[PDB]
């Protein structure tokens, strides 16, 4: 559900946390962006077909 | 030079200035305005204004020498009158005309719904209300509901009188509509409340005064 | 890139069915 | 708009006098407010050429701004701060972007109320698009620089 | 630089024929 | 039929001619010539002209169109592409294609467009001589890209073409250039031996004094890639050095130059520069001379792309539509990407001998090499610790200990990035997958930066590029 | 650059202007003056600048103007008339077939009275019928009387001109029951057309007891208008169409037939009108699966259209109560008993619910 | 019904099946009447790879048309133009705009059903200039939409979908605008990413009210099947599990039903079980994947990752039972699975502890907008020298 994010050690006893990300907002916003971009690309191409 | 130049412009684009109101753009060079003065000019448009946000009903600026378009307004500025009975709001709910159920029922879904949150009346599929009218005996208190839900909301509750459209001052009746309903356009959403229609808008005009 | 899904299928009920018997 | 004057009477621009009085002058006319102001004027004694005394010690003067632009070329901001800029130009760029792809697609049309219409010419995203990359650039730039000139320099 | 370029072929016609009469433009314009 | 054959004549010769005359004849205006002349005309002389109604040959009519030289023997050259020898592999004229002076009827009517015979004949220091000559040494020798055609006119064409050629001039360069492609051509693409080379070389040098790019570029490609089928690869390798190539060359001319200078740099241990020169030839001109290329430069460029570490994937075999051509070599791909020896070895050694002609040959050898560092990056990035005998039996290496020799040369390199323990049988992954974590998130913005860089100069000078000759052309 | 500054000097003094204003031309002189008419301004006889603009002689061209006497500018591009801007106003409910659908036999005998003729006239004139006169609609309330006529002017493609007996509405003289024929000049200009006259029987009440009907005095009137007129009696596109439920309103030229080109007797809504009308609408909500439209209109009784589509009206209520995101079946067996309460009060006042 | 011809005419493109498949094309086009069609048809269904038809020359005529088929339809068709031109004749005499409209857009959707597409589209412009009800609108230019799924020519797909797409929201018509979905949720298996293809689904279900469309069991079966191949874990325990919904109507999904479970029980001995089997058995059946690499790669990798993600050290008998194919075949999988960055595990076979290391951060995040960047990067320099040429 990622509620802390950690990895749980049967082998041992133990519970591994992983604590306060060092994901940023940053980088997850321009990964929508990036995605609209590669379908403008598609749609000049076939405009471009025509000038030549 | 061309800052300099756009400088020549600054200083005519500057006061006096009277408000017209942009009817339409037929050109970037020439458009068609109605003035607030109650006189319409087709007048000449300079440099270094924006026509993209004027395009569509828009405030705009003319300079009192030229007598011609030197500037543009906002479409939100000019606004006759914002708001009133929402920081003016009675305190009357729908807990002091505690009874009459299927007028509390109706009322509550066609005004406070839409304003609240348009986008679950929509989700359902049926269309979020329009136009609203209500007729019944006068014995019922319409007021009294439409006091309910302006305390309710306090924001986006416009209160406009009719005898307060009309004007001795010239050419603003007209404009004076324009204004208040221009702005509703811009702050989305917002309810227009018209007290009684059947003492401004009659049946019966003459139209020989 | 190569084709995964051909020897998958037929892999994986088998070798499970083998590994079954031979380690939990 | 400034405009000179001596002022003589009427009648001296009446029967044409005037113009024998100004030699050497070269006059002008300029037209703040109508009719009304050039006919004031004429009435006068028009626009008197004026002249200015300047030089480049003067000049030098009036030019100025800002000595405190020593500190100011190299400071730059707190990183989370470069993060707010870089997070918010993405995240607007994303809603330009939809009517993009029609703009590729078409805008056969050359004449400018039309176009505003059809591929929303008129708030266009290529416009905006560019001056966004173009901010997003140089001031992500100017920061980084910045930070790593200071570091080595100081110590 | 697509859209750029739908403006420069529609262009192409007029630039490309004006040429000739800029030539023509000042011998005539010295005449008269 | 000959009473067909006249209407088909008389419009094409017309044709091609107006739109060579009328654009060299302005003598002054050399961007838009010397871009017009070499891909437009010469272009529409193979793909349009020829296949366009019944006969491929129009060239009767079209020696009388312009002039060469007034005594019919230069004329000779026009009968003998129809019929000596072979007769190409074109459909010839019945008739009316004579030997010594094609035709008995002239389309001239005293244009400057379709010239006059006496006209042109007084011309010798002026330009309108050798362009004429040119255009029909041109139209003549045109047939030979779809033919491939040998030894009919094309013996004494060589000399013909030497003949044509003086001291020359920039406009006259210009129109020349044509010519030259040919002139390599005709013994170097059959792949007779004889010299092509002395008119070549005698061209370049007369060229660059004038400086005229057209010119220069088509000799140097030329020279290259005649070397490289005599099987005489040293002679290419040296020439290369020695070779400037003008930046103001058209887009044909680059595009050849590219894709044969490209198999040279692979030869030397240079695959990233090969890589793509090859790719951007094709998108940068196509053309009619173009379309027996692309096999050979698809077919090339993947071998090549194998040895500079990448494995190419599925997709990019399905959309050129030339899959078939592709095909053997895409067994050798899926090869890598498993990164198995043993498949290798067997594939490449039945197909091995379809390789040799495309210049595959001497790379070969080396792409075995490229599968196992495919499988030892596998072996260390997926894994920690794994015993160095089950690498042994995964891979398809001859012994265990031929393992621990290989992990141990690919370290060095350090593309692996890993530590073989030889004493304690296992490989230890030293590695961890990042690419934020040292100074290297850096360097992934410095790559993906870098290609864009190129990508802007190029829009923005493009964009501007048709508006640069109006501004010429007197418009604001 | 160096042009757009170059033109920027020139303008500031060129602008420098007295105003301008906009009128129209209702007449030129021949002398080549125009008479125009200023909108906020007295009319003016004043003469044109040719340098800019020889259209502006032109009559019945809206035209700019430049003050400096108040000549005139260019004609704008940019046109209206009153007649398309009553339209305009209204924005008229406008509706298809299938709402008036499942009444069978009503669409056949409105179809060819009023919407062939319009079409082509031309049809008619070969078969030799003369064109249609009057169209008088009488039926019981609450059979789709007003919005068939709103209806057929989509379908003709056709503008509805309802004259409703507003003062408001009229400004072509004041006032409309001497404005017989200045609205069949601008019908014919922005034709086909048809005009509508209606009686919602809620105002108005006290002129039909009256004497027949000041509502049937407009009607009387135009229709005796459109019997002849012209030579455009030869020729018809404009109806004069009647909106009544009473026989007693009818005066002597309605009352005869060959004098009407039809009188048309509506059939109540049946159990197919409810089912035609109702799945048109459940189209534009979410619907969930396995629900019957058969089922929902053969239990409503309705009175009118206007019930059937109360149903799927009141099933958006029911699913915001229950918060759904789909309208489900229980939203619709709430729906349609308390649309049967609408119904049973419209029936116990033996008058209409609106008002 | 329509929708089955869509899903038929992709199942002899299965990689995994080519032979069978063919015998599930014919059955729906011999009902429906797109025999007239059919020879031109053809040609695309040789690149989908094989057709019994009656002019194939291709290898399955094990199931071969009859010859009198391609004539019924072919006199029929004919027949229906016949009196359609005296309906036109008829359509003067009444009101020009009514009749003729009405003719002649049911004669456009019925040579849509046969699959000519040429003249499905003449037949419709008129319809579109004159007055007709919003809902039929979007139902016509859907059949447009139709015949080019039908077809396989992707092109084609596009054009109908980008115009459609416009009318729909315009509209009031909500259910209508679900049944776009479906016709775009067959363009979603089609190509290579199945993943867009399960929200359409999920919605469509809800609403799109049965006409043009199968019975509500057979479409259920469908919006279960895809949801498990986009959705993980989380997403799918919240979507379908939580739902009062399921338990009202009643289950008749089992083995489909097990597949769903399968992972939220974490235990992939009996994922992978349920897998190998229902893989052939959906897959085959109706189209949600001509390209059957795609499928298992993505489940796969899900199945690994998410046992990692929960757990830090496994058994090396654990790991080669869960998973089920040979220990050889995981360690060349994993090699793979690794590349990407979001497994990030290590295995050590001589000291038998597998170990994931497992970071969750910013490195995951970092590594997509690096990993997007290069396609569409790589595209900007092919368009741009096409451009300036």
Redesign the interface.
């Known amino acids: 559900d990622k509620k802390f994010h950690g990895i749980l050690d049967q082998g041992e006893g133990v519970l591994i946390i992983f604590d306060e990300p060092p994901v940023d907002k940053t980088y997850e916003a321009a990964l929508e962006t990036i995605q609209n971009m590669s379908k403008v690309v598609d749609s000049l191409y076939n405009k471009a077909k025509k000038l030549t | 030079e061309f800052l300099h130049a756009q400088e020549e412009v600054k200083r005519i684009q500057s006061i006096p200035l009277v408000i017209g109101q942009f009817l339409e753009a037929v050109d970037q060079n020439t458009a068609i305005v109605g003035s607030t003065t109650g006189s319409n000019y087709y007048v000449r448009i300079l440099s270094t204004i924006d026509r993209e946000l004027l395009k569509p009903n828009a405030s705009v600026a003319l300079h009192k020498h030229s007598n011609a378009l030197v500037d543009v307004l906002p479409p939100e500025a000019d606004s006759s009158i914002m708001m009133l009975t929402s920081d003016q709001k009675p305190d009357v709910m729908y807990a002091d005309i505690g009874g009459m159920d299927i007028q509390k029922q109706e009322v509550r879904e066609a005004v406070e719904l839409p304003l609240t949150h348009f986008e679950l009346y929509k989700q359902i599929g049926i269309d979020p209300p329009r136009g609203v009218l209500m007729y019944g005996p006068p014995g019922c208190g319409k007021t009294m509901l439409a006091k309910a839900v302006a305390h309710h909301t306090t924001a986006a509750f416009i209160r406009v009188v009719g005898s307060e459209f009309v004007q001795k001052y010239l050419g603003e009746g007209p404009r004076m509509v324009r204004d208040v309903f221009r702005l509703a356009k811009e702050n989305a959403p917002a309810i227009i409340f018209i007290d009684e229609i059947d003492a401004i808008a009659t049946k019966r005009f003459d139209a020989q005064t | 890139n190569v084709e995964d899904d051909f020897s998958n299928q037929l892999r994986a009920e088998l070798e499970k069915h083998g590994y079954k018997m031979e380690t939990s | 708009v400034i405009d000179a004057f001596r002022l003589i009477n009427a009648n001296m621009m009446v029967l044409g006098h005037e113009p024998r009085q100004t030699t050497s002058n070269l006059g002008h006319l300029n037209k703040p407010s109508i009719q009304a102001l050039i006919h004031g004027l004429n009435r006068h004694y028009y626009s008197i050429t004026i002249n200015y005394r300047k030089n480049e010690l003067e000049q030098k003067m009036l030019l100025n701004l800002h000595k405190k632009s020593w500190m100011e070329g190299l400071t730059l901001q707190d990183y989370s701060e470069h993060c707010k800029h870089n997070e918010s130009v993405v995240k607007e760029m994303l809603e330009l972007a939809k009517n993009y792809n029609k703009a590729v697609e078409e805008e056969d049309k050359m004449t400018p109320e039309q176009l505003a219409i059809k591929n929303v010419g008129k708030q266009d995203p290529k416009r905006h698009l560019e001056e966004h990359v173009d901010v997003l650039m140089t001031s992500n730039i100017v920061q980084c620089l910045a930070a790593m000139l200071d570091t080595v320099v100081f110590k | 630089?697509?859209?750029?370029?739908?403006?420069?072929?529609?262009?192409?016609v007029?630039?490309?024929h004006?040429?000739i009469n800029?030539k023509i433009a000042n011998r005539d314009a010295e005449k008269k | 039929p000959a009473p067909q054959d006249v209407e088909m004549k008389e419009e094409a010769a017309a044709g091609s001619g107006s739109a060579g005359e009328g654009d060299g004849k302005a003598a002054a205006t050399e961007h838009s010539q010397r871009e017009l002349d070499t891909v437009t005309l010469e272009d529409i002389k193979e793909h349009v002209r020829q296949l366009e109604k019944a006969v491929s040959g129009k060239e009767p009519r079209f020696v009388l169109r312009a002039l060469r030289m007034l005594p019919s023997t230069s004329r000779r050259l026009n009968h003998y592409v129809l019929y000596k020898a072979v007769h190409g592999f074109f459909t010839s004229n019945n008739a009316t294609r004579d030997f010594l002076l094609p035709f008995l009827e002239e389309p001239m009517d005293t244009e400057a467009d379709l010239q006059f015979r006496p006209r042109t004949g007084k011309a010798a220091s002026a330009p309108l001589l050798p362009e004429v000559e040119a255009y029909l040494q041109l139209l003549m020798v045109i047939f030979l890209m779809n033919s491939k055609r040998y030894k009919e006119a094309q013996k004494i064409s060589d000399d013909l073409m030497q003949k044509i050629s003086t001291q020359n001039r920039r406009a006259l360069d210009l129109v020349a250039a044509k010519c030259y492609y040919y002139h390599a051509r005709v013994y170097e693409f059959l792949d007779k031996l004889d010299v092509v080379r002395s008119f070549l070389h005698a061209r370049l040098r007369t060229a660059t004094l004038r400086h005229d790019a057209d010119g220069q570029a088509t000799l140097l490609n030329l020279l290259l890639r005649n070397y490289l089928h005599y099987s005489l690869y040293d002679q290419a390798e040296k020439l290369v050095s020695k070779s400037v190539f003008p930046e103001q060359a058209n887009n044909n001319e680059w595009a050849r130059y590219l894709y044969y200078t490209g198999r040279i740099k692979a030869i030397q241990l240079e695959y990233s520069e090969a890589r793509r020169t090859m790719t951007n030839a094709l998108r940068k001109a196509p053309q009619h001379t173009a379309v027996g290329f692309k096999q050979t430069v698809h077919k090339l460029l993947i071998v090549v792309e194998l040895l500079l570490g990448e494995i190419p994937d599925r997709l990019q075999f399905r959309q050129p539509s030339l899959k078939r051509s592709l095909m053997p070599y895409f067994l050798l791909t899926q090869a890598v990407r498993t990164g198995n020896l043993a498949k290798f070895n067997q594939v490449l050694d039945q197909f091995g001998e379809k390789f040799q002609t495309d210049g595959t040959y001497t790379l070969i050898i080396r792409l075995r090499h490229n599968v196992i560092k495919t499988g030892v990056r596998m072996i260390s990035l997926s894994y920690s610790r794994i015993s160095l005998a089950d690498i042994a039996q995964k891979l398809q290496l001859d012994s265990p200990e031929d393992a621990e020799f290989i992990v141990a040369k690919a370290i060095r390199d350090g593309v692996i990035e890993a530590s073989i323990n030889h004493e304690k049988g296992y490989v230890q992954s030293k590695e961890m997958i990042d690419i934020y974590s040292t100074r290297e998130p850096q360097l992934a913005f410095h790559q993906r930066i870098s290609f864009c860089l190129d990508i802007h100069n190029m829009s923005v000078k493009a964009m501007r590029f048709p508006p640069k000759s109006y501004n010429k052309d007197l418009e604001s | 650059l160096n042009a757009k500054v170059r033109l920027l000097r020139e303008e500031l003094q060129l602008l420098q202007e007295q105003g301008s204003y906009v009128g129209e031309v209702v007449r030129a002189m021949d002398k080549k003056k125009v008479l125009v008419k200023v909108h906020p301004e007295g009319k003016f006889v004043v003469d044109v600048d040719k340098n800019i603009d020889i259209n502006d002689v032109t009559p019945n061209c809206r035209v700019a103007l430049r003050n400096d006497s108040y000549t005139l500018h260019k004609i704008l591009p940019n046109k209206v008339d009153p007649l398309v801007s009553l339209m305009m106003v209204e924005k008229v409910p406008d509706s298809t077939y299938e709402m008036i659908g499942g009444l069978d036999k009503q669409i056949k005998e409105i179809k060819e009275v009023i919407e062939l003729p319009v079409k082509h006239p031309e049809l008619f004139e070969a078969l030799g019928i003369a064109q249609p006169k009057g169209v008088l609609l009488y039926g019981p309330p609450g059979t789709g009387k007003t919005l068939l006529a709103r209806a057929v002017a989509h379908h003709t493609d056709c503008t509805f001109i309802r004259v409703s007996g507003s003062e408001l509405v009229q400004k072509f003289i004041g006032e409309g029951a001497r404005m017989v024929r200045e609205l069949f000049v601008m019908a014919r200009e922005h034709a086909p057309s048809i005009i509508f006259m209606d009686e919602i029987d809620s105002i108005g009440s006290s002129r039909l007891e009256g004497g027949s009907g000041g509502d049937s005095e407009v009607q009387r009137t135009m229709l005796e208008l459109l019997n002849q007129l012209d030579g455009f009696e030869a020729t018809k596109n404009i109806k004069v169409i009647m909106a009544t439920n009473r026989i007693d309103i009818l005066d002597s030229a309605l009352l005869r037939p060959g004098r009407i080109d039809r009188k048309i007797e509506f059939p109540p809504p049946n159990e197919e009108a409810r089912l035609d009308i109702l799945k048109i609408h459940s189209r534009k909500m979410n619907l969930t699966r396995g629900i019957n439209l058969r089922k929902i209109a053969e239990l409503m009784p309705g009175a009118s259209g206007a019930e059937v589509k109360g149903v799927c009206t009141e099933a958006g209520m029911y699913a915001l109560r229950e918060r759904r995101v789909h309208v489900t079946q229980e939203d619709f067996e709430m729906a349609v008993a308390k649309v049967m309460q609408k119904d049973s009060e419209k029936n116990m006042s033996i008058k209409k619910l609106w008002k | 019904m329509p929708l089955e011809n869509l899903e038929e005419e992709g199942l002899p493109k299965n990689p995994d099946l080519r032979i069978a498949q063919l015998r599930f094309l014919l059955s729906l086009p011999e009902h429906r009447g797109d025999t007239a069609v059919r020879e031109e048809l053809m040609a695309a269904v040789r690149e989908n790879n094989m057709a019994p038809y009656y002019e194939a020359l291709c290898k399955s005529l094990d199931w071969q048309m009859d010859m009198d088929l391609l004539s019924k339809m072919k006199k029929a068709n004919e027949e229906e133009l016949k009196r359609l031109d005296e309906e036109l004749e008829d359509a003067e005499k009444n009101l020009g705009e009514s009749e003729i409209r009405d003719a002649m857009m049911a004669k456009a959707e019925y040579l849509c059903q046969i699959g000519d597409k040429e003249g499905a589209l003449t037949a419709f412009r008129k319809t579109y200039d004159k007055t007709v009800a919003l809902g039929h609108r979007l139902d016509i230019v859907f059949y447009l939409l139709r015949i080019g799924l039908f077809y396989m020519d992707n092109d084609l797909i596009t054009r109908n979908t980008e115009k459609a797409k416009s009318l729909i929201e315009e509209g009031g018509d909500w259910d209508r605008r679900n049944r776009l979905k479906v016709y775009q949720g067959l363009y979603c298996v089609a190509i290579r990413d199945f993943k867009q293809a399960a929200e359409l689904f999920l919605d469509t279900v809800s609403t799109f009210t049965s006409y043009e469309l199968m019975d509500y069991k057979t479409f259920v079966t469908y919006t279960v099947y895809v949801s498990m191949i986009a959705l993980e874990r989380p997403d799918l325990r919240e979507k379908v599990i939580k739902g009062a919904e399921i338990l009202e109507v009643l289950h008749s999904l089992p083995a489909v039903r097990q597949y769903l479970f399968s992972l939220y029980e974490c235990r992939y001995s009996v994922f992978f079980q349920s897998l190998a089997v229902v893989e052939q058995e959906m897959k085959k059946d109706w189209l949600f994947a001509p390209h059957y690499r795609y499928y298992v790669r993505e489940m796969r990798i899900h199945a690994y990752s998410q046992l990692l993600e929960s757990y830090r050290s496994l058994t090396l008998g654990y790991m080669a039972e869960a998973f089920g194919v040979g220990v050889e075949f995981i360690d060349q999988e994993l090699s793979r699975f690794i590349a990407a960055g979001r497994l990030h595990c290590k295995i050590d076979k001589v000291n038998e502890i597998v170990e994931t290391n497992r970071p969750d951060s910013k490195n995951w995040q970092y590594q997509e907008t690096i990993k997007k960047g290069d396609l569409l990067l790589n595209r900007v320099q092919k368009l741009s020298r096409v451009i300036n040429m």
């Open positions: 630089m697509v859209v750029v370029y739908l403006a420069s072929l529609i262009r192409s007029v630039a490309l004006n040429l800029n």
